[PDB]
Design a protein around this ligand. Sequence first.
Ligand SMILES: Nc1ncnc2c1ncn2[C@@H]1O[C@H](COP(=O)(O)OP(=O)(O)OP(=O)(O)O)[C@@H](O)[C@H]1O
Ligand SMILES: [Cl-]
Ligand SMILES: [Mg+2]
Length: 502
Amino acid sequence: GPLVPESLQEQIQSNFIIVIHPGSTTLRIGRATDTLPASIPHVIARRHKQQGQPLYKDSWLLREGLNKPESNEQRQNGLKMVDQAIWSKKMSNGTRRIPVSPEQARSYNKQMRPAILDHCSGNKWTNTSHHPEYLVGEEALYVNPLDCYNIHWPIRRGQLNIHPGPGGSLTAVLADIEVIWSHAIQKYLEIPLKDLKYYRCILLIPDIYNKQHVKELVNMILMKMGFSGIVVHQESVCATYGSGLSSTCIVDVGDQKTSVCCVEDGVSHRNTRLCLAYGGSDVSRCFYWLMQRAGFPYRECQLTNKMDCLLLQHLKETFCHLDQDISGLQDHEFQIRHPDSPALLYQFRLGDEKLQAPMALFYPATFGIVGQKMTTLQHSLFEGKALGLDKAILHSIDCCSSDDTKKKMYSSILVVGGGLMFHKAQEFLQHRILNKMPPSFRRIIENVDVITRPKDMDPRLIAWKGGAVLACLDTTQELWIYQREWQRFGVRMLRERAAFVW
Ligand SMILES: Nc1ncnc2c1ncn2[C@@H]1O[C@H](COP(=O)(O)OP(=O)(O)OP(=O)(O)O)[C@@H](O)[C@H]1O
Ligand SMILES: [Cl-]
Ligand SMILES: [Mg+2]
């Protein structure tokens, strides 16, 4: 409650604490005093050192296992489960939702031609005339695909993006992280790197984390970048802080990973931890596939193409919904303003695809991913099969030992991150939870409450905000690990001094 005059707010403690929340697609970074953190595409373009090197592009909306022999059938059967769930749920007036045909749409759609809004789109490729060794964030996304740059996303599906080839070693990934993080600090926080010695860092990490990798990051923060101290915490607990819910089931739907777990007073219960290998991006790809069947008028779209991918993400965020009551064929329009093209405006007609795609989050077989580990527990048949979001929430809560805990968890489900930012998502999910949960508890419990915009904030920023909040906490004074303790004892510090059980 200490209100600080503007003449002094650059001198309070939290002005010298940098809060860092990495993501597969977006880095969120800022001073603990910033109201909004900077949001950067967590990506880097690196120049070739020679002529005639093959262009490496990281996968984004594509991933392994989409084209196995079984992929197409699995996709089909999932979409039938989605459809069954859609039909099964009556509309507000109590009637059935009348399905509309993809073919009916296709007929109208591929008579559609784009109009031009402008001769030039108004966007251009990042300029690389001066041969930068690298580019970061949005500048990286806008590198002409024909330029001699490899594109690297240091994080995929919420873990370090290690893979065969250039940029895929642990060391390359760490160097890319450092370059990306350092660039953001100088450019957006406007903090010279030589000054980091006066700063401390709060690093948010996944609920289920990799000890070795966290170790490395901490080493990077303290030793390579020059922060004097650091505090590491799980993004799930931070989410609870940012939202003000001491006890709650937390679900973080990101672009590529979905976390579920139960948190009780700053503690994520290991036995309740689940990580699912899908998120917003999978929905984006699915929506694309559905739209193609409806005669999607942009016919030269490709999933391997960054600009197209931004378009698909955007289309999903504009059209997709989880509202039973929005039905029928609707007339829509969208723009394309890519570099090297005109500003284009497209008419087209969409039906159930707008609802089917987001619901694949509850029927993830729809993604048609075959032969991959899809589910992860904290230190198998259950892993290779993808688990719907609601089943995961339930399963997680069911892994609480106490029943008073469970009462608390069913009663409060917090949903965080961007992945589930669809219209009516809160209601939609609250409805499934009621019907799907154990009926014994459904009675004992006054209501199931799903929270999506707590305090009416941006779900993408809740955890980051919690990180800042964590810096103000009294118990936090004892969490800091400082450079010299690290240089000396290293990993021993985390075992001794981590807020969570290392
Ligand atoms: N209004 C919206 N409607 C639907 N989806 C949205 C909306 N806004 C953002 N998203 C989605 O949120 C996802 C990104 O969420 P977020 O930035 O929390 O992920 P991340 O932290 O980068 O990824 P991860 O947590 O998987 O590592 C993207 O798939 C994006 O399309
Ligand atoms: Cl906000
Ligand atoms: Mg995330």
